[PDB]
Design a protein around this ligand. Sequence first.
Ligand SMILES: O=C(O)c1ccccc1OCc1cccc2ccccc12
Ligand SMILES: O=C(O)c1ccccc1OCc1cccc2ccccc12
Ligand SMILES: [Mg+2]
Ligand SMILES: [Mg+2]
Lengths: 345, 345
Amino acid sequence: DVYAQEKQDFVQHFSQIVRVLTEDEMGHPEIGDAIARLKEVLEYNAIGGKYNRGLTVVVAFRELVEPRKQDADSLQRAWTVGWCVELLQAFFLVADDIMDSSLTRRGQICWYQKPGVGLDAINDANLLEACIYRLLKLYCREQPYYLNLIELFLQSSYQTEIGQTLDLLTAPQGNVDLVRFTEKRYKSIVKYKTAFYSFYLPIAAAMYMAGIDGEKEHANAKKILLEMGEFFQIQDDYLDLFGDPSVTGKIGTDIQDNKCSWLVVQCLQRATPEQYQILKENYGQKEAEKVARVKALYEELDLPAVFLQYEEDSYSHIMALIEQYAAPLPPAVFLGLARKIYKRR
Amino acid sequence: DVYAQEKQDFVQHFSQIVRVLTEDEMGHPEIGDAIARLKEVLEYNAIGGKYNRGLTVVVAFRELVEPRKQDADSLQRAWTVGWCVELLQAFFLVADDIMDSSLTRRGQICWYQKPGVGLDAINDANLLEACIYRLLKLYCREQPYYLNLIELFLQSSYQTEIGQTLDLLTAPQGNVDLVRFTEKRYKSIVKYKTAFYSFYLPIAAAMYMAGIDGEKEHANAKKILLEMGEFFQIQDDYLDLFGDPSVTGKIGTDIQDNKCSWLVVQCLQRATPEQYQILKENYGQKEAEKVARVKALYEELDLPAVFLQYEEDSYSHIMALIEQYAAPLPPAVFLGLARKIYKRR
Ligand SMILES: O=C(O)c1ccccc1OCc1cccc2ccccc12
Ligand SMILES: O=C(O)c1ccccc1OCc1cccc2ccccc12
Ligand SMILES: [Mg+2]
Ligand SMILES: [Mg+2]
């Protein structure tokens, strides 16, 4: 496994990342306390996940760069840019946990929920974002792709923020309005809020580092990657309810949380007026019996069979996209990712 | 007045700024609702202030660029970069109002306090920040100073966020610990949280636009501007309590809010153990009689006379700094600013 092979070298680079970021206090001791708080923010929020997005930068870089051009300095830059992706995600997750009043993340108390943190986490989230550009400057400022990476990280942040705006307007806290939960709205939320940063950004970053800056090659890679991002989120919505928590590592709450899930989108497209009333009365409630009623309506509408058919059609479509749009990139760059996303676990 | 002369052309450019930012929805109609929310965020938060920071970009640009090189396109870029400074400030103020639980800003309800907004303002603040880089790309991407401006806005955001971290650690909500309120800590908060973005950023931006990119010229301009920023905040702290609200346009609350004000810093340096107890028991309280006791202690310690002596020494020092470090820039660039800041109103 190319990911399990790079993981330890990637996680081990984090100590250097923290060291380099908390080494600006040497010349400025007056900001020492703020720098110590920065270290705590990084350690709590950037560590603990699976690092799949950041690892994708490293994996794609090794497949896109000639093995002779893969010197020690080039690999340090790849690990650094992979960590910038993880920091970008950490900035989004800290802020999103505040906005939707979450209690836990990765089975651990949300950063803002820690005693003595609270709404100071807004500033902590801004610092995580600032760390991306500090790292790009420290490691990549003399590289010809420097401006390409800055613009890519800034664009990915804007797209994600637009997707978050779209999501907040679609499911306003207290407003159980299923009329907003259309397929077109669902697809736009996924595209902007998750697909760009999760799938396009890591590969595009590795492409720029490899000197692949062509607009056409990026548009082609994007076409494959946004489609993979769409399937990823649809499968994640499906597994939230019908997945095995022992396998997924999570017990889903999308129904309780009034989420614009692919499942509710499909349910609304297939429900009779009476079935709609059942969903209208039980969706967004914390009661176990009420959540069981929504699950029951989903099984009545054969949503697991609709999902399975969708998974099959999506996999054929992604292989057709790879075949048409991969060249001149090695198909392995997209195939490695497709196997990680589509493999039935 | 060079500011009152540029103001109307600057404010009038805002409609174009909004138009250009809300004109990315043409090719992507799916994000229309998020773009309409973006427009509302811009209109509520970027409009209403005095625009002094953004206007400084425009004023300095006209004094730094040859009048022949001041064509229509160059001036549009100067107004755009001035607006990027105002957007950067708007991003900070929306977030800061959430973090310190403020009720009003410019006599108007804080954006997050508006019904239906709340903690969604965290995302609205991230969008204001993203707008800076959208505008720099749209207007300045073909300019030789493009990367210089991106790096300047990113560095100014990082410095401000560091200053905000320092401020939050110094005055934790509920923790009335006057031991933290040292002169050295006060000066670091002002430097990072306000002086860099308020004074250095606008002039430095105009310098890059004028092709003045030398590290030495920027270090020299910075030395003058950070000192002006320090005086600005000290005078603002003094006027918060001893200013005339009819003249300042504000009724101060620093004492009630447990602020690390220059006044409390000076009070702590001069107070006997008994005077310290009076301040310890009355600072950070909303009761009018208790605030009057702090004011009384300040007048007993002759803080208005200490301030006036400080204002005189600071003005001599800023003129000495201008004399030594202005060249090769026109001294008028700094003198115009010094008059706006030091003039007794
Ligand atoms: O890692 C996660 O957030 C995750 C969460 C839930 C289920 C599976 C997950 O990982 C799959 C995954 C593998 C390899 C590269 C990836 C690149 C972008 C997104 C996901 C990726
Ligand atoms: O405008 C404000 O925030 C403000 C608030 C309170 C008192 C006076 C103020 O303005 C003075 C001022 C004039 C010209 C250029 C400036 C550049 C940066 C900061 C201030 C400036
Ligand atoms: Mg999910
Ligand atoms: Mg003040």
